[PDB]
C-alpha cells in the first residue's frame, strides 16, 4: 500500500514501482558487443563521443530507450553504479542523452580479451 499522495496519482506511484521492481542491465540493454578499437579516439565504430572526452579494446553496449525511459533511468546512475560495483579498473565513457543511440563504451586500464566478456556476463 502507498502512504503518500503517490497513493492517488498513477504517476507518482509508478516511480515507487520502479524503485521496487528488480531491474538489472539485461532489462534495459539491447545489444552487447566488443571491439579492439586500438585507441579511445580511434572510434572504429565512428563515434564523436570520446573525442570530446579527450585499453586498445572496449565493451560497447547500446542500451534501450523505451526500456530505460520507462524506468526513468539515466546513463549517469548506470555508469556510477558500474564504476562503484567493479571499482576504477573499469572506465565508462557513456553517451549523452541527446543522441539517438544509447551507447556505453567500457574499457579497462591499469586473459584480458575474455575478461570483458567475463565482467559483462
Amino acid at each position: 500500500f502507498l502512504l503518500g499522495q503517490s497513493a492517488r496519482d498513477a504517476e507518482r506511484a509508478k516511480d515507487i514501482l520502479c524503485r521496487l521492481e528488480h531491474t538489472t542491465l539485461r532489462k534495459v540493454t539491447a545489444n552487447t558487443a566488443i571491439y579492439y578499437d586500438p585507441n579511445p579516439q580511434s572510434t572504429v565504430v565512428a563515434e564523436d563521443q570520446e573525442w570530446v572526452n579527450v585499453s586498445p579494446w572496449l565493451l560497447r553496449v547500446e542500451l534501450d530507450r523505451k526500456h530505460m525511459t520507462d524506468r526513468k533511468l539515466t546513463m549517469e546512475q548506470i555508469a556510477e553504479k558500474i564504476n562503484a560495483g567493479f571499482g576504477d579498473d573499469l572506465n565508462c565513457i557513456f553517451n549523452d542523452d541527446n543522441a539517438e543511440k544509447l551507447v556505453l563504451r567500457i574499457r579497462i586500464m591499469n586473459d584480458d580479451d575474455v575478461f570483458l566478456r567475463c565482467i559483462e556476463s
Binding site: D70, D97, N98
Partner: protein, 161 residues
C-alpha cells in the same frame, strides 16, 4: 561579472565554454559576450561543486557537448540570449538541455510506459440498479455466470442466486 580565477583548470574550462558558445556564430547576431558568459557558467558550476575533481570536469564537458550539439542549436541561442541564465544552465539536467523533439519523444515514451503498466480495469456491466450495503452508493458493476456484484466506491462484493 564572473570573478577572475587563477586556477589553470578553471581558466581552461572558461576558454572551452567560450569556444562552445562561438560554435555557429550565433553570438555575433545576438551581440552576447561569450567570454563573460563562459566565465559565469564556469563560476556557477564551481560554486556548486567547490572542487576541480572528475565530477566538475564531467559537468563542464557535458555543458560543452550540449552547447556544441548540431541537433540543438536553439539551446546555445537561448543561453546566448539570456533566456537561460548561466546559473540555471550550470544546474540543468541532460533531459532539460535536450532538443524539444527529444524532450517530447521522452515524454511520449514515459506516458506510453505508464499506460502499458496500468492494470486493466476489471470488466462488467456498470449499473445503478444495485445499492451497496456498506456505503449505500449505487455505483456498482455486475456480471452473470448467478449475478456477481461489485461496488466501485468501497470494493464490497456480493452475489444474487
Amino acid at each position: 561579472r564572473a570573478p577572475s580565477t587563477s586556477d589553470s583548470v578553471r581558466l581552461k574550462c572558461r576558454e572551452m565554454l567560450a569556444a562552445a558558445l562561438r560554435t555557429g556564430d550565433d553570438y555575433i547576431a545576438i551581440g552576447a559576450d561569450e567570454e563573460e558568459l563562459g566565465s559565469q557558467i564556469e563560476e556557477a558550476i564551481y560554486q556548486e561543486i567547490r572542487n576541480t575533481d572528475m565530477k566538475y570536469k564531467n559537468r563542464v564537458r557535458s555543458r560543452i557537448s550540449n552547447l556544441k550539439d548540431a541537433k540543438n542549436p536553439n539551446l546555445r541561442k537561448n543561453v546566448l540570449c539570456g533566456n537561460i541564465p548561466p546559473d540555471l544552465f550550470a544546474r540543468m539536467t541532460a533531459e532539460e538541455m535536450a532538443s524539444d523533439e527529444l524532450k517530447e519523444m521522452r515524454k511520449n515514451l514515459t506516458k506510453e510506459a505508464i499506460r502499458e503498466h496500468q492494470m486493466a480495469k476489471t470488466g462488467g456491466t456498470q449499473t445503478d440498479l444495485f445499492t451497496c450495503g456498506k456505503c449505500k452508493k449505487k455505483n456498482c458493476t455486475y456480471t452473470q455466470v448467478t449475478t456477481f456484484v461489485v461496488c466501485n466506491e468501497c470494493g464490497n462484493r456480493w452475489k444474487f442466486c
